[PDB]
């Protein structure tokens, strides 16, 4: 019965001025206070601020990083809370999480709203093979590798040998390099299939309908 | 201005066995009214958080008995009696009764496994990505534990700041280690520039650093 479900993620540009929204449902929305905390890719979940309840008259609070920025604010009367967020940067691109707090802190969270700030537009990726050379690395095994790199949004899928090769396999985690992502993925196979035989890494980036096959060679 | 702090930022562990997480504050967070609003949530990979304890030692409902809170004023301490595979993720513990309010750095629960060096390579420049005048050194770094590891880049000897981009897998599902990987993008002019490109991992499996290096030709 008790609901608080986000929206208004989505791209935003920076210096921007997004604004999310948490509908809540099941309880008495008045007698609660309301949080909002956003976990950055790979960083830590933190905390921005608070709005109060009825009694203690609706008064927010903010962190020392959102405050000049953000703005929270309630629909007492529909049971919707806001997140006005003005002055967007990159930093700001995480998971919105809205929580009441009350008798049991905040023990009902919503699910979560994925904003990404960005002033990228959509590229393709730039795809490249990872050969080794005078040594392979592993007892009698080869890495090989490729690297994704200039794309945005995310994701990309990177396959070796059309989903073949899935053992032995590391995708790493995209970073950011000027707006764009850039992303490597390696595998291990024995010395006796490479390069006798065949490794290609598939690499789909749907957001600009790319899919590009790279032959590994040596 | 009550400055937090939680221990330990990572802690390994074997499943069965006791975990004990610790939330100090350098003042007392006990609130005028008597209360002690500290909190203890749990966030998991890609799902939101969840609490676990409210109020120093209420445990919320529906959270097993072997999660125990406990402490007042300045020091207090998550306990989980008896560590289960649901229980990996990422704990917090929060107060907000007094500023700085905030959640603590957060302790990763990871599994415990035996030391390995890592599987160092280094990878040249593409041809490809040559030809469109930008050059990328990769080193991969797979498979070692614990995750604490550190990479320089040396060019011609000389070590290398600017330019590089690391990225760290999260513990293998299947082999409890990690991976990493390290990229160094210059210019195919400052490629065609210097001739010898190492990669040199530091781990606590080896006083000796491995090194790992090509000569461009």
């Known amino acids: 019965e008790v609901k608080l479900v986000e929206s208004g993620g989505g791209l935003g540009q920076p210096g921007g001025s997004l604004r999310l929204s948490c509908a809540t449902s099941g309880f008495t929305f008045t007698d609660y206070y309301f949080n909002w905390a956003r976990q950055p890719p790979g960083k830590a979940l933190e905390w921005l601020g608070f709005i109060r309840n009825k009694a203690k008259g609706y008064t927010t609070e903010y962190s020392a990083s959102v405050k000049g920025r953000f703005t929270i604010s309630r629909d007492n009367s529909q049971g919707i809370l806001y997140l006005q967020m003005n002055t967007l940067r990159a930093e700001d691109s995480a998971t919105y999480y809205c929580?009441?707090?009350?008798?049991?802190?905040?023990?009902?969270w919503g699910q979560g709203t994925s904003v990404t700030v960005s002033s990228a537009k959509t590229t393709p990726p730039s795809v490249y093979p990872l050969a080794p050379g005078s040594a392979a690395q592993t007892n009698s095994m080869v890495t090989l590798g490729c690297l994704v790199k200039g794309y945005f949004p995310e994701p990309v899928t990177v396959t070796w040998n059309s989903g073949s090769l899935s053992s032995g396999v590391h995708t790493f985690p995209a970073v950011l390099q000027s707006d764009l992502y850039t992303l490597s993925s390696s595998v291990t196979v024995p010395s006796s299939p490479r390069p006798s035989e065949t490794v290609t890494c598939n690499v789909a980036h749907p957001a600009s309908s790319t899919k590009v096959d790279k032959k590994i060679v040596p | 201005d009550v400055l937090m702090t939680q221990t330990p930022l990572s802690l390994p562990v074997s499943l069965g066995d006791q975990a004990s997480i610790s939330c100090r504050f350098s003042?007392?967070?006990?609130?005028?009214?008597?209360?002690?609003?500290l909190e203890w949530y749990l966030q998991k990979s890609g799902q939101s958080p969840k609490l676990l304890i409210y109020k120093v030692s209420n445990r919320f409902s529906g959270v097993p008995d072997r999660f125990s809170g406990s402490g007042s004023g300045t020091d207090f301490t998550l306990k989980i009696s008896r560590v289960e595979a649901e229980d990996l993720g990422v704990y917090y513990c929060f107060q907000g009764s007094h500023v700085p309010r905030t959640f603590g750095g957060g302790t990763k629960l990871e599994i415990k496994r035996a030391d390995a060096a890592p599987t160092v390579s280094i990878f040249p420049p593409s041809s490809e990505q040559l030809t469109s005048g930008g050059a990328s050194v990769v080193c991969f770094l797979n498979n070692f534990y614990p995750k604490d590891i550190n990479v320089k880049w040396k060019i011609d000897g000389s070590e290398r700041q600017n330019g590089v981009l690391n990225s760290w897998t999260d513990q293998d599902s299947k082999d409890s280690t990690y991976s990493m990987s390290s990229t160094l993008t210059l210019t195919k002019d400052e490629y065609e520039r210097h001739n010898s490109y190492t990669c040199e991992a530091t781990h606590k499996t080896s006083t000796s650093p491995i090194v790992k290096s090509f000569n461009r030709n």
């Open positions: 929580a009441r707090w009350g008798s049991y802190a905040m023990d009902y």
């Open positions: 003042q007392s967070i006990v609130h005028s009214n008597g209360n002690t609003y």
